[PDB]
Design a protein around this ligand. Sequence first.
Ligand code: SF4
Ligand code: SF4
Ligand code: FES
Ligand SMILES: [Cl-]
Ligand SMILES: [Fe+3]
Ligand SMILES: [Fe+3]
Ligand SMILES: [Mg+2]
Ligand SMILES: [Mg+2]
Ligand SMILES: [Mg+2]
Lengths: 626, 625
Amino acid sequence: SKTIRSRSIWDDAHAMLEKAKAEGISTVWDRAAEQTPACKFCELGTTCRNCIMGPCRIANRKDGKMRLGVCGADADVIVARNFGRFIAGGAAGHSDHGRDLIETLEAVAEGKAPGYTIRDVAKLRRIAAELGVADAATRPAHDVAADLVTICYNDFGSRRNALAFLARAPQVRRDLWQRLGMTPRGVDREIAEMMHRTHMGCDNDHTSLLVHAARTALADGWGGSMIGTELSDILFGTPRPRQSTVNLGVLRKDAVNILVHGHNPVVSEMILAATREPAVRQAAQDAGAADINVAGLCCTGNELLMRQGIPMAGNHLMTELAIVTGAADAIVADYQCIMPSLVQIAACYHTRFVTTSPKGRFTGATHVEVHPHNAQERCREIVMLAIDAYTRRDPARVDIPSQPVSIMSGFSNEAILEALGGTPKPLIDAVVAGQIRGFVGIVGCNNPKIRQDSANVTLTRELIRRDIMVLATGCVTTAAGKAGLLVPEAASKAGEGLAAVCRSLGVPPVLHMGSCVDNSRILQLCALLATTLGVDISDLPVGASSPEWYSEKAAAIAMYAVASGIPTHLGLPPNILGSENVTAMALHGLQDVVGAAFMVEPDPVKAADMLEAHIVARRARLGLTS
Amino acid sequence: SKTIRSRSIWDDAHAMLEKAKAEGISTVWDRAAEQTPACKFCELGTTCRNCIMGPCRIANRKDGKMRLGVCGADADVIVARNFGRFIAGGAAGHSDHGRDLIETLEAVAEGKAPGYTIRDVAKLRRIAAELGVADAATRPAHDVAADLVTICYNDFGSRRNALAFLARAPQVRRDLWQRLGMTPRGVDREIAEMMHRTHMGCDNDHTSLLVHAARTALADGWGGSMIGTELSDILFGTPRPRQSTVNLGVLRKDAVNILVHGHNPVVSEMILAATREPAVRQAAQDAGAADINVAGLCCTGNELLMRQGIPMAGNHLMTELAIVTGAADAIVADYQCIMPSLVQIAACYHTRFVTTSPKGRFTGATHVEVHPHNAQERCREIVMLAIDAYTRRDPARVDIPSQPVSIMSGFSNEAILEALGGTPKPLIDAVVAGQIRGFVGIVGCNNPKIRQDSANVTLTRELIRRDIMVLATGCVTTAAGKAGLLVPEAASKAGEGLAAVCRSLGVPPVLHMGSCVDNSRILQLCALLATTLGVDISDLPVGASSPEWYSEKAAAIAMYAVASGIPTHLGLPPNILGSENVTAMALHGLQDVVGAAFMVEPDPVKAADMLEAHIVARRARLGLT
Ligand code: SF4
Ligand code: SF4
Ligand code: FES
Ligand SMILES: [Cl-]
Ligand SMILES: [Fe+3]
Ligand SMILES: [Fe+3]
Ligand SMILES: [Mg+2]
Ligand SMILES: [Mg+2]
Ligand SMILES: [Mg+2]
């Protein structure tokens, strides 16, 4: 069908879209159509609901009516406040994510987290020493962990001048942020200050609002997300390269299928552990299943892929379709990007929809709350619920539509450096020689406005063909994986220089660097290259892109990339076009503030042209001649 | 004109609206008319812009379309999320306010804040001891201040199970919050968690969202605001009863008039100090002025009234009209509730519009940024700018319209207990005897939807006539003051029981308890009475009301009052009526959960009836006539 083929590039999506239609199940694409046309003011950003003197709408009329809100605020202020709160929502998601990792490490240090441990003591000691813990190399591991917990929690307080991990950024970048008033000080503090600035009659200057939006996003990339990544590696292991598989075919008709969905590995790692206990496996065998099969969705799926090689069922717009296979016996959710439509779709089948976080409550879900002290017991109960649901699966409604395809995952900065021999020198040498022109992180989401994964995959293919290595995270991981680009043999799809480097190292031309919080790994890598070369991040031949973004988190990631010196492309515009001044600041003005800017471009080939053009210019800034 | 008369009850407002009309100057009321009718979905709360799969609107269509957002969220979730973020914005305003006081007190302790001091050393030692500082009674004052700073900052961290001042709440109330998951833990943490919960695909249960809204607001009332109030008393003095005046007539043709606008006394106190320096006074006299006349607007005006008796020129909807007098030589702003239209109106005159906070930037303003290390120097500089502007005032456009009305301010809890002889016993005995039937805090704003101060004044008058003492904060202060309700002789306006107690104590029937952060004083008073009587705040004959509210801050105050057990009336509905379930929770469901609920009622006489009815029911459960 042409309408169904227009919604996604993938056969597995098409098959489940057909099954959903036949069964009368409404999907995210159906609801997107209902919501089109959108409200013009909402789309432009020229609407405000921040007090009950309003709500207000801003028009552009020759007679001057409705030019200002009731309080006097103009389109520039209203649009900038709205965008600031949008950014703050994304930073807040990453803040709570990182905070939960601190709380879990603390519980381990206290001896109050059955089934959790310090999996990577070497990294604990290295990170602790980096951040100033005394005698981190030799003191008892739990004492070192307790001191690292204190440092991390202090970044969630209000007494710092600069976040702890900010020391990774080059001195020139730190000095610029300091002069601009952009230095992130406290992970929660910047969010609170954003919410204050956007209250009526506080910050009424669009430039000031956007500068604080950058500071808020920086407190995510260098704070909430970076703490989340580094502590996740400490608690659950530092990723190393491993093979796995992707697509809806990772579900198995003969197994109990448990889909983990959401974000935090504190839950999904303990779900996986529960499925390996002998009595739990025996219960599944008694129910007639051959195995218990955990498969991943979205970022928590990325986490289990990076650390445990667990196959990934799908990304954002696959989530409803994964239930439509009829073979999902449970979805185990925590928080973020979990569409509430999944509760209703699960109810069309036998699938248990289980929530685990006090923050991720869904009306009608089965709530089994997880905390470090009870996770081992509670995750066992959740797996038993999934086995019970399996006994009620209707065989006649099962359609697992595809066979999975192979992928390589696990490219932490530690794994990349190990592949290079311990230092970044061979990578720098390849860039200087012109074999690799530059690097682009392709990050972020799906969005029903764009045929699913069409731009994600086309941009990836375009960049590697141009000898630009791609670093993939988030829901782009699934797109690149299903396209066959996450394997070493995909070097045949790269240009001659990138293909040669990739074959020499035995790595794909697209490196999976993890979940959305793991975009902090991209910041760390950029800072390392810049510090090694004695330059700013804004001097490096790098870029970032989210061709199909949707979320507040993706906007926060794009903003912290830009504010750190990385040109960042977005496939779709934020709701800001109602202010020409805010739009011009985002697309042009920021170049002269932070050394990078946003780009908005829905044609992925043109986006590749624009990203390549920045890389060409940065190579010239570095004096390269190759 | 007839339209002008319909916009306010006050002569000074009418005179300035007539003047603005004659001069072609538009006001908040003109822009409110342009924005009516409002977008129906925005007004109902059934619109969401939290991701670019949207924006979404929830409609009731015969074809069943648009019942859900693109992510699947229904009207209950969308409305509850919108209300949660609204509350979070209010809590955040009070969070940063309190944080600035911590930073200033720390700068004093470090010796890096010229012109700032510990003005109330005894209160510093008392608060420090209450919160656990060792030897707070005997150590050098600045050492004790440094330890109090650390405790307050820990409440802005992520390691507490409960905020430090929560210990004031009665045990039964703390036990209830703990079982509901409402205990506030960190002032910034609850705001951040609210923004996380309201991201797409996080909290999708309207009950959970409203429970966290209560927790976020409680982290304001017992955290951001309470720290702000108590540290302000430490740095600037504990308010005591004193005389002052209110209305546009506090401006003086023969003086350099400096309006202080916004919220934080760390700036307005230092502006006031600068105007008192001899050389600055001489510069004003050299310029032709008789003196320098500081006058307050909004909450920073309330702060200067409470601690220094500085006259208050007006509340929220008077702010544009104060510039229209033509006599404002400077307006000195920090943050919150400062309408950006004031920059444009100031530009119609000689008035300088000066911003002082890195958070309160206004395109076109003169920015003179204030911090503890430079406040004394910068505030002197700002006053000199006002004196210079005075030399260019156009006397043809000066019209200061009224005679100022006398008020009494300064009713901190410390002052109230002192008037009672040191304990709450005479106040409890007046309640038991039925002379004072109950207490209502009338708090919050103006709103162009309601004839300015009409409901604030009517509700205050109705309550005192029913022997219900009124505690006034925020922009209500100006309304009660202009109505002649803030003086001891106003006992003649109250019922016989309240009048007799007021005359016995020498106090007005309406007690000015301060700025909007000073609603924390009302929480402290309720907690003291509840603990004294061995009951919950939800057992006390109390209520709260914002008849003319507008701001996110006012909604956060209302929510923390409800969550603390205080029945709370609002004159206008929040943007929640698109969800019957969220509305029913706010108006009814919370009653069984936290012991109090919101009420929405635009008729202030009916609002008086409803607040009195709650007071009567609670008196009965205490065993009182
Ligand atoms: S803050 Fe200003 S623009 Fe926004 S709703 Fe209130 S009056 Fe309208
Ligand atoms: S969060 Fe859901 S309801 Fe809100 S804009 Fe996004 S898709 Fe629409
Ligand atoms: S829904 Fe109200 S302006 Fe868009
Ligand atoms: Cl620091
Ligand atoms: Fe993501
Ligand atoms: Fe106020
Ligand atoms: Mg713990
Ligand atoms: Mg300081
Ligand atoms: Mg709970």
